[PDB]
Amino acid sequence: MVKAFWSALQIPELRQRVLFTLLVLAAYRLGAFIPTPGVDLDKIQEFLRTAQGGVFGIINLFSGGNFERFSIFALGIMPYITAAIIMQILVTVVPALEKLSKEGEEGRRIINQYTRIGGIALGAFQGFFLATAFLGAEGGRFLLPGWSPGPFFWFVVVVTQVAGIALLLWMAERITEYGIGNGTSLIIFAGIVVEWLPQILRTIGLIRTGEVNLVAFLFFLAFIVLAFAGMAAVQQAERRIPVQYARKVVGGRVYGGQATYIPIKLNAAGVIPIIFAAAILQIPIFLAAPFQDNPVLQGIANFFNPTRPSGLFIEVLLVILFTYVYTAVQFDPKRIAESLREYGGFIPGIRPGEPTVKFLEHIVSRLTLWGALFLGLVTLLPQIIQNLTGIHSIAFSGIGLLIVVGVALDTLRQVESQLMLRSY
Amino acid sequence: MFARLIRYFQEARAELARVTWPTREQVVEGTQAILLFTLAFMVILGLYDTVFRFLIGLLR
Amino acid sequence: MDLLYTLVILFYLGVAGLLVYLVLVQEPKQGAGDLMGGSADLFSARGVTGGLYRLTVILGVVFAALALVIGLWPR
Ligand SMILES: CCCCCCCC/C=C\CCCCCCCC(=O)OC[C@H](O)CO
């Protein structure tokens, strides 16, 4: 898939896609420098470096560093995502929405539109909530000189955030349409990796100075490479199920052609469950953390802190669960068996029909567990590595690595899979 | 029941034993690809916020 | 500066709401999956929503500039 990487910069169409993507991401990053009126960014950054502010870390990380500078997209593309989750929940809870999801042409469009509308509304709600519970709280703690905690400021913030995430959702969809990879995933990706290089340079400077010893740093780096290589290997891994084509009935017995196989990945392609797990983890923190004067809500919020043992455990569980469920939904044995049926293929020793689906379902359900567990391991280990090396960075957290490698692999996989179809 | 999941674990372990792992060239390929991608966007975004903060700093 | 500032704010709100409308109207051409990279072989780039594309870009810049304006506004 390196060939895909270079061809995407070589081939005019794909390089147009790349340039457009880079342009949009440039617009987003630039948009990170446009502040919400009335907000004192200095005090926000000051608070985010305090002990109680640390819990906002992940919230900032997935905001693309925007929450830190409280830009027009203060929470990033995250509101939309949240809505999506909600929608999904409804779809799997309300039977009417499930029917609407399975109608075909229209319905999925209606659900998606509801997701977009709900996303914007969510950005409105979150803008208001943050304006009233955190920004103007404590006698207008994070306000600017000349601003007071009232309905005018709330109105301003709400408007800013609504228009902001509207524009950002639009930008994401335009990346999806006229650029490489998926828009949302690339926006989160950019929002995460934008912080990597300066942190590397800073840490290196600290090594030269003497605050960080070289051994811990080398372990950190080597562990990152290990993470990349490991995720790559597991993504490239597959369970082969022996099948046969050109089946002919001779002497009242079923025979087949040359023995082949169908490959089944440990995990279904997609960084989406990681996004959903992250957002789900972010909800209680978002609801509880703003209230700085309430030890209870601070306790609840810090309980889900991905840096702390409890929150990290919860995060691991969320990643494993969401991955396993998503892989279960994507790898439906019925459509696989029917795909083997339309091509005139069969499983040697297994009768066609429902027993075949049973065989496939059994193998898949027993298999994908390990991929889920692996993603959970990748979720877990980096925090320990940071604790042992003394080099802490939420951007290089297990969840962050999962995002980066996930998006990279997805984009390259799609590009390769499409240029392959172009060549043939 | 505990027996159900303690059986599920064994069967899943058996399926783990039947996993076809990728070649060396595949892992090298994937890792190199990931590195190129990540590094590329790191550099590009780096130039973005560099030029941006330099121009904004110029405006003062 | 009451009337003037109020007019600036009204412009901000108007641009915001109009932007919301434009974004909501521009519904993506969907497929089976919720979010994908899509087939990047076809050049596409039909007229489809070009006027509203350019309009959304312009209104994005205007909205940003208005955020900067309200930010720079005196006491
Ligand atoms: C889902 C929404 C949940 C809302 C959760 C609210 C949390 C309140 C906690 C502390 C506030 C303390 C100040 C309370 C201000 C009202 C004054 C008061 O304390 O009233 C007591 C009353 O007089 C006795 O009879």
The whole domain housing A270 covers 1-424
The answer to whether residues A120 and A165 touch, using CB atoms and an 8 Å cutoff, is yes
Distance between CA A118 and CA A124 in Å, rounded? 10
* Chain A residue set in contact with B, beta carbons under 8 Å: 1-2, 4-5, 22, 25-26, 29-30, 33, 189-190, 193-194, 196-198, 225, 228-229, 231-233, 235-240, 263, 266, 362-363, 366-367, 369-370, 404-405, 408-409, 411-412
Is the CB of residue C63 less than 8 Å away from at least one CB of chain A? yes
Task: Give the Å distances, CA to CA, from A385 to A20, A46, A197, A226.
Answer: 37, 27, 19, 12
Distance between CA A242 and CA B20 in Å, rounded? 12
Tokens of A229: 């290589």
Q: In terms of Cα–Cα distance, which of A225, A220, A195 is closest to A391?
A: A220
Task: Write the CB contacts of A33 (distance below 8 Å, at least 6 apart in sequence).
Answer: A69, A71, B52, B53, B56
The whole domain housing C3 covers 1-75
Contact B30 A197 (CB under 8 A): no
Chain A closest-CA separation from residue B15 CA (Å): 6
Distance between CA A174 and CA C48 in Å, rounded? 13
Evaluate whether chains B and C are touching (3 or more beta carbon pairs less than 8 Å apart).
no
DSSP at A247: -
Q: Using a CB-CB distance cutoff of 8 angstroms, which residues of chain A are in contact with residue B37?
A: 5, 408, 411-412
Q: Can you give the C-alpha Rg of chain C in angstroms?
A: 17
Q: Could you tell me how far CA A16 lies from the centroid of its own chain?
A: 25
The conformational region for residue B40 under phi > 0 = left, psi -120 to 50 = alpha, else beta, is alpha
A350 phi and psi angles, rounded to 5 deg? -115, 125
Rounded distance from Cα A290 to ligand 1 centre (Å) = 17
Q: Which chains touch A (3 or more CB pairs under 8 A)?
A: B, C
Is the CB of residue B47 less than 8 Å away from at least one CB of chain A? no
Cβ-based contacts under 8 A for chains A and B: 109
Distance between CA A194 and CA A29 in Å, rounded? 9
For chain A, how are helix, strand and coil distributed in percent, rounded to 5? Answer: 70, 5, 20
Task: Write the CB contacts of A370 (distance below 8 Å, at least 6 apart in sequence).
Answer: A266, B12, B15, B16, B19
DSSP at A346: B
Q: In terms of Cα–Cα distance, which of A328, A330, A315 is closest to A397?
A: A315
Q: Using a CB-CB distance cutoff of 8 angstroms, which residues of chain A are in contact with residue B46?
A: 194, 197-198
The whole domain housing B30 covers 1-60
Distance between CA A305 and CA A320 in Å, rounded? 18
How many structural domains is chain C composed of?
Answer: 1
Distance between CA A347 and CA A360 in Å, rounded? 10
Tokens of A86: 């909600």
The answer to whether residues A355 and A346 touch, using CB atoms and an 8 Å cutoff, is no
| Domain harbouring A57, CATH code | 1.10.3370.10
The conformational region for residue A258 under phi > 0 = left, psi -120 to 50 = alpha, else beta, is beta
How many structural domains is chain B composed of?
Answer: 1
Q: Could you tell me how far CA A404 lies from the centroid of its own chain?
A: 9
Structure determined by: X-ray
Distance between CA B9 and CA A370 in Å, rounded? 10
How many structural domains is chain A composed of?
Answer: 1
Q: In units of Å, what resolution does this entry have?
A: 2.7
Distance between CA A154 and CA A162 in Å, rounded? 12
Distance between CA A93 and CA B27 in Å, rounded? 40
The answer to whether residues A74 and A164 touch, using CB atoms and an 8 Å cutoff, is yes
